[PDB]
Design a protein around this nucleic acid. Structure first.
Ligand SMILES: Nc1ccn([C@H]2C[C@H](O)[C@@H](COP(=O)(O)OP(=O)(O)OP(=O)(O)O)O2)c(=O)n1
Ligand SMILES: [Mg+2]
Ligand code: NA
Ligand code: NA
Ligand code: NA
Length: 313
DNA sequence: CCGACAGCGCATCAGC
DNA sequence: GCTGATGCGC
DNA sequence: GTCGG
């Protein structure tokens, strides 16, 4: 709360730019400024003081000046009381409903969850699911449940074929006490960079009633919903399964471990050290992909190997 | 003044 | 029928 | 929106 007023303002502005203005880069810019200010071990007294921090420019400095001089931001106060802007912003909290669909819905007088429920025919499959589990999808998953979820995935995966390898990634692998969802990386000897693997795994997870719904499903990427077996019922949870080639495991596990800001900074720094890095390979006009552990990637771009727990940014 | 800020996989829409 | 663009969520 | 070409 040292600079909580400021960081709250910037985060709120960020969401507006993403959900209403449809400006993801302004969203990212506001998020970046909020993040650096949250690390600043001082009580900010002026916009010029905040201006010194990387990610804080002239506009945010001006906004901070107004906030420190009035206790509020007129632009934000007006946004909050705007019915269409607030409705658009809220509807995007439904999975499957982005800035475009939210705006279209609000233009049609559809502004609430109640409105969505009585207009189900106007929703696609993904949106219907996002609406059905609206509350559950905004719940956090305690690591203990993540462990129980991991146990089921790992057990059923081997039950299909012992050659499969499944690894839970993302926040869980970064050792978070709670996660927003579950991210699973899957590999098999049959699928390499040069040469129904995902389908069989998904089918088995459905057979034991772990997976309850499907948002999207192709040959390499699954997005769906899962639930632990009950005793009170556990909330439904979001789960992704990604099938990547086995000879590209290290780049894959690195990317899906994250975090998103961390990956964003790794891509940037790689570009400086004369590298380009994706979820598949890392290349030196680019060259041929290099042989790879995770530390190897850090070594190419000249970085000390940070454990997953230190990859928040 | 002005473009990058990564871009992928899947569902769905737009159009031949 | 198809290819490509767009929206969406990573 | 900020940064840097
Ligand atoms: N815009 C994004 C979103 C995600 N990721 C990567 C890093 C993440 O770790 C991983 C999985 O995405 P999640 O949304 O699940 O993020 P987390 O698992 O890290 O956190 P959460 O607990 O909210 O699920 O994909 C990325 O590179 N860029
Ligand atoms: Mg996750
Ligand atoms: Na600055
Ligand atoms: Na949404
Ligand atoms: Na996820």
């Amino acid at each position: 709360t040292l600079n909580g007023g400021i960081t709250d303002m910037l985060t709120e502005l960020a969401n507006f730019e993403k959900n209403v203005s449809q400006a993801i880069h302004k969203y990212n810019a506001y998020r970046k400024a909020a993040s650096v200010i949250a690390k600043y071990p001082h009580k900010i007294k002026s916009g010029a003081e905040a201006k010194k921090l990387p990610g804080v420019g002239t506009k945010i400095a001006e906004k901070i000046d107004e906030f420190l001089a009035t206790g509020k931001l007129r632009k934000l106060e007006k946004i909050r009381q705007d019915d269409t802007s607030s409705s658009i912003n809220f509807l995007t909290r439904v999975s499957g409903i982005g800035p475009s669909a939210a705006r279209k819905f609000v233009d049609e007088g559809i502004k609430t969850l109640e409105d969505l429920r009585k207009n189900e025919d106007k929703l696609n499959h993904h949106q219907r699911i996002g609406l059905k589990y609206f509350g559950d999808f905004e719940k956090r998953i305690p690591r203990e449940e993540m462990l129980q979820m991991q146990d089921i995935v790992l057990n059923e995966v081997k039950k299909v074929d012992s050659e499969y390898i499944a690894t839970v990634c993302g926040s869980f692998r970064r050792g978070a006490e709670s996660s927003g969802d579950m991210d699973v990386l899957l590999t098999h000897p049959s699928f390499t960079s040069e040469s129904k693997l995902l389908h069989q795994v998904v089918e088995q997870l459905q057979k034991v009633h772990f997976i309850t719904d499907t948002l999207s499903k192709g040959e390499t990427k699954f997005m769906g919903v899962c639930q632990l077996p009950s005793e009170k019922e556990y909330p439904h949870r979001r789960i992704d399964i990604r099938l990547i080639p086995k000879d590209q495991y290290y780049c894959g596990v690195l990317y899906f471990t994250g975090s998103d800001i961390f990956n964003k900074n790794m891509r940037a720094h790689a570009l400086e050290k004369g590298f380009t890095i994706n979820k598949y390979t890392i290349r030196p006009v680019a060259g041929e992909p290099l042989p790879v552990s995770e530390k190897d990637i850090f070594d190419y771009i000249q970085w000390k190997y940070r454990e997953p727990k230190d990859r928040s940014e």
